[PDB]
Structures are given as C-alpha cells and as structure tokens.
Design a protein around this ligand. Sequence first.
Ligand SMILES: O=C(O)Cc1ccc(-c2ccccc2)cc1
Length: 185
Amino acid sequence: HHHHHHMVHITLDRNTANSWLIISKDRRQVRMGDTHQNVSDNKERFSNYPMVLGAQRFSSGKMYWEVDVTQKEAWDLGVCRDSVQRKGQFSLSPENGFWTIWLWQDSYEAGTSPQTTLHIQVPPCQIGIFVDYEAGVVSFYNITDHGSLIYTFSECVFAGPLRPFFNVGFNYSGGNAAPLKLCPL
Ligand SMILES: O=C(O)Cc1ccc(-c2ccccc2)cc1
C-alpha cells in the first residue's frame, strides 16, 4: 500500500479507559493492570472489557496509524463511532458502531456480524489501520508481511465522528500482559 503519507499522531484518552488499564506518560502505550488503577468512575469508561479510545476525532479525510501487538494472545483494533455504548455487554459490529479486527485463540477475525475468518500466513507484530472517511473504507495491513492487506470494510456507514479503538484483552492465561503500542511515524 501507499497510505503511509496519511500518517496521524494518535494518543490515548485516559478518561475513556477501563479502570484496570495503565496508559504510559506519553499516552502512546496501554496494558492491562493486575488490579483497579485507583481512578474515579465516569460515564465514558468502558466497564465490561479492557477498552480505550484515542483522543483524536475524525469526520473527514484519510488517516493512517500503526499499532504494535508483539507477543499478545488477544486484542481488538480499529475505529468506532464517538457515541458507541460504554457500559454493559455488546458485540463489536458495524451495526453497533465498530469497524474492527481481532486475535482470539490463535485465529484472526473481522468484526462483521457474524464475524469473518481472516487468512494470515505471517502472524503480525504491527498492524496498519487506514480510514477514508469520504469513501466509507476501513482497511487493515500486516506491517510484518511487507504491508499485505488483511481486511477491507467498504460501504461503511460511519454516521458520526470516528475515534481510534483499542482492546488490550483479558489476561486470564498469564500470556497476554504485553501492551498495545502506537508506533512512531
Ligand atoms: O448510564 C449507564 O448505563 C450506567 C452508568 C451511569 C452512570 C455512571 C457514573 C458513575 C460515576 C460517576 C458518574 C457516572 C456509571 C454507569
């Protein structure tokens, strides 16, 4: 791909984070803590899952960023509407305002309803995310495999401002403690 020149500097929004997440001083890394991180509750925080939003809001244009997923067993990445549900149980789907892919139990899937199997020969250590607001496209790229395409959501109906979306996943196994990191431009 040739999307690198639309690179944007994403930072994480602490106020949206699940109360167990630990966000680095530079707001570029996030990991699951082993306990509540001693913050007050608020209506923005994701309650049920280890999720957090980027601070940036996009309503036009082309945007690109990269995320490091090295040695994680489980995670979700993509974009979502600014007005997605924060509290209780929900599925990641375009109907609910999410355009995402994930790793879970050694398989990669796109967050359609129902979910779509992804075909990845080279397990990615870094994922590139491209959004074309006007075209209604969200695309995912395998940076470890020379930028190969993972998945394209097309005919997207965003229906609002978009925010970068992250889930570091649970760590029931003891093998999923590693952080998500926003990679430098
Ligand atoms: O509205 C809901 O679906 C659940 C809900 C509502 C309010 C708060 C809340 C907690 C502490 C300070 C402010 C607001 C948390 C969850």
